Amino acid sequence: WGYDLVHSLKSPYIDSSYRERAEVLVSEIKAMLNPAITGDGESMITPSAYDTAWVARVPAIDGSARPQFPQTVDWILKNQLKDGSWGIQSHFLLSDRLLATLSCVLVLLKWNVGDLQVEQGIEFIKSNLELVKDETDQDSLVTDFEIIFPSLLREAQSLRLGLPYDLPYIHLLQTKRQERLAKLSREEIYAVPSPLLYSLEGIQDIVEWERIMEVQSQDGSFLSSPASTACVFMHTGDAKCLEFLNSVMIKFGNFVPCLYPVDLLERLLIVDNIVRLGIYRHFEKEIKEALDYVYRHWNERGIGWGRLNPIADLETTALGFRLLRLHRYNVSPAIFDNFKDAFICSTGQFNKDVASMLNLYRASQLAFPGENILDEAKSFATKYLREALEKSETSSAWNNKQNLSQEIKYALKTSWHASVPRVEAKRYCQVYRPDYARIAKCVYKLPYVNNEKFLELGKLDFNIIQSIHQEEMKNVTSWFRDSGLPLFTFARERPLEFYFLVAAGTYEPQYAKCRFLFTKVACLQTVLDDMYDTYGTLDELKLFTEAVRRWDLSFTENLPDYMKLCYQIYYDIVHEVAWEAEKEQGRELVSFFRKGWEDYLLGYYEEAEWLAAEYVPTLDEYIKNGITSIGQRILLLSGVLIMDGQLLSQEALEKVDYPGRRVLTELNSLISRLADDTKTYKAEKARGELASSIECYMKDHPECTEEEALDHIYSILEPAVKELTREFLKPDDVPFACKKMLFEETRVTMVIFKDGDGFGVSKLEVKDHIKECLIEPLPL
Ligand SMILES: [Cl-]
Ligand SMILES: [Mg+2]
Ligand SMILES: [Mg+2]
Ligand SMILES: [Mg+2]
Structure with missing residues (x-):
């Protein structure tokens, strides 16, 4: 690692x-x-062989004894599959082959052509129908198969074709047909367009053709189906039906598909x-x-x-x-x-x-x-x-x-x-x-x-993209090694984890600097976090916090040795970020970043005072402090202001970042704090850690159960997630790449804290995501 x-x-x-x-x-x-x-x-x-055969049925409008669209017959004669069925060779689906083949056999017979194709088609249908033992054998059904196939098969029966009409599977299909037809509102067929318009060729005895034109589509089709439209045409002579069929032949040449457009x-x-x-x-x-x-x-x-x-x-x-x-x-x-x-x-x-x-x-x-x-x-x-x-x-x-x-x-x-x-x-x-x-x-x-x-x-x-990120990770880990941060042995080293947090969402090659600086700040923050909530004493922390106010390297002579070093690294990273941001943005930002860092660390210090006093805050207090102190706001700012080509005026920035308002950075901070709590509060409770949002609510509501408490936290999280989504997608004049960067970091954060049972974060699942995202390439 x-x-x-x-x-x-x-x-x-x-x-x-x-x-x-x-x-x-x-x-x-x-x-x-x-x-x-x-x-x-x-x-x-x-092509749909099935629909093409229906179109092939249409007799010449000049009254001659031949198809109106003879090219479809030619197509059918030339496109039979080796096994005697018609369909797409790459995929075998019984119901598809049965329906299409019977459809083709019947139109060839109508025009008294294709003796061989018919012979081979009939054999396919017979032999495959006899392979069906039970229902689980039928496989996936094409649209309205149960309605259409019994109808089409009865047409064959009237011609006395050699097919196994008396098979149980055939009787079952007629049974299913009745089941479907029973729920049909027939009078409404003519008034309210319905999915059955797609398959009128299967319900010819039911449809009053003189009333069906009311639900015809504007292009003359019946729910975009050439077969269904061809059927209505042969019953009515409707001009618009014919126009639809013509338009499909014009588009495709010598076949039609099963839906168009x-x-x-x-x-x-x-x-x-x-x-x-x-x-x-x-x-x-x-x-x-x-x-x-x-x-x-x-x-x-x-x-x-x-x-x-x-x-x-x-x-x-x-x-x-x-x-x-x-x-x-x-x-x-x-x-x-x-x-x-x-x-x-x-x-x-x-x-x-x-x-x-x-x-x-x-x-x-x-x-x-x-x-x-x-x-x-x-x-x-x-x-x-x-x-x-x-x-x-x-x-x-x-x-x-x-x-x-x-x-x-x-x-x-x-x-x-x-x-x-x-x-x-x-x-x-x-x-x-x-x-x-x-x-x-x-x-x-x-x-x-x-x-x-x-x-x-x-x-x-x-x-x-991944290989680009791998080169960036070399730079990150190389910077990290020489940065001084490894000297803080009370803190875990997690440079790749933080790089992943940003790179898994904001991945584009031009945003290398964004990812780099974001990672630096997060590495610093994990040290600052451990220092304030665990390692430092309140008196040490009071000293560090005063140094935070002063922005003066010379002032650190007063600090304990480890804090002298910590302050130096902090001060350098803050001003490197600020310089890069000022470069990208073309306006002053040191002051804005400094204020952001003070508010954040003063937030840590407030929390540190609570821990030292064993004070359990109200939920309102905890969330207020947490939104400020969890650290997502200043981290997000450290990345979002240094995105190549992405200009953020103060005005635009305030639309996505504004402490005290439900904007992107605020919502992310809130969601992060509470999602974390839902994922981790139980391990922390067991360890004897300071109260979380759950515990704070329970102090606010002495009679309420832990369960009600957790439910309440989720009642805050869920609305916040919806607002996050709206803030992200909302139309505005904030560069979208910036909003996306903020949103995607939130999404990756939410992955880490998903399914909050309270036990804690899975360090192994994190590693697996890093492996999948950044380490292992796709085989080509
Ligand atoms: Cl497939
Ligand atoms: Mg902390
Ligand atoms: Mg901590
Ligand atoms: Mg936690």
Whole structure:
């Protein structure tokens, strides 16, 4: 550990060639995304054999005995898989292959072509249907499979195709179809747009086609589904339906996908993945263009995956809310009322429902003060997700191959606030799949979202940043060794821990100086802390505190030897920080820093007097002192004022730093003090340490229990965390990098104190985070 471990690191990723390579990847990615963000190549989605076969059914509008879109028939004839099914070869999903193959077989028969393909398709369907022994064999179901497949299979039955209609699994599916159809409000089909519009081709006996146009989308589609629209067209001759089908053929050539457009969901998925891979800083322009488009279509009624959907989609809407808010757009959690009653979202195909609830769960964590609906959403999504873990569908072959249960479990144990940013990006680089397949009417892929380039850049960029930090850690530990701080043997040496506290969140190459000075100050502070609350005597501390007031090196002749040294190092670090800040800021700051240091250490001295008198403060007193004395404020200031290119006027600084006000530095200090207390008060109580916030409350409330006391501390912490979030994301003219630096340091602090049982901080978990974040690179 420390000096020896760090100087043994020799990362190759430091060489300029790696960053130059990463820049080529950045340019390639910009070029790849351009059609989706700026051009007309939006909605890049794979073919749906199933939908293509429905479009192929449409007879020529000139009345001739041939398809209106003969290129789709040609496509189908040419794209059968080796096993006789139609679908995407990379991924096998039984329900997808069954539905698509039966769909294709039937249209080839309609046009009396493809005898061989039909023969091979029928064999696939028969042979695979006979492999199903029980329900656990069926695997994940494509959208509305239970409704559509029995309908499509009855069409085959009327043609007397050689299929096993009498299998128990087939009877079960009809049973499931009835179950679904029974909850249907049929009269309302025509008045209130619903998810079933996506699959009208499966409920043809139910729909009065003469009334269904009322819920048609503006582009002529039925909930963006080519199959569903083709069906309505063949029943009605509706011009707008035909226009939709034409527009999709024009866009894709000789096939159609199972959803179109997916303009909103695709843009959001692109941004989500770029952000989670930790590569967002390279694509500010593209993220802004993408989110601006989404925001244009954002409305009080929510959004669908496609901007023309006549009903909102929770998945897209929850994702949109989170990414928009995170990027400082103004959105209200009131949009979630669109998914309530008397919360529902228990209808639809399983993967979509789970995705919607994962997204709702993550969105709920971005709550601002007073947003009760998000607390409700959090509770609801949590319960949903825990139940989903117990459902057999979650353990289907399809879901297991994608590690769904692992993903759900990870989401539930992960608090957005209590996250290490660099670590989350590293971890996502290890989970992201370039060939990820999604499910709707058929299995599909979105290559703008899931591709090799994203991952290539993710892993490389992570490794480069890490190697840069490793060189910085050599500088840190080298400075530390010669700094004099190791001479204070009453204090633990933790230079890497403090470097991690800042570098795990504020990682960009240009902020080397910020990280360096922040680490120096934190190293000094741990000594000052041990000195005031443990090692020093009150009379010694009174002397040190007077020296603090005087700012005079000559005055230290009066101090004990160890304090003479401590004062010298303190004085040097304070003024090095101040010089750097004045350089970056172009205005005087020595006086402001000095006042900050005095208030902080006078805070320690007040606490030292309490300890000496065995005084237990009121909770109000303890928190007041703690906000000032815990040390986060002066430490944060020591970093935030020396960020390359980040100008903070007094006016701007006061927006994020203002003792006595609920601004970023104040909230961080409050949260740090109380989170620490919740994590540590029990070990400290046992050791006989001076009272914490818990103990102070109990003195204030003699009859209250320890349990009530701890609950009260959390009742202070939780509101404070929401305010922190709002202060961070709030639109203003404070350089965002500065606000982010403050917020991210708070987030890493919260990681250290997460899950406060009172026992103490896990020193081993800290080491593991440092190892993961700063020591071990990603294999390429
Ligand atoms: Cl996959
Ligand atoms: Mg202390
Ligand atoms: Mg201490
Ligand atoms: Mg503590």
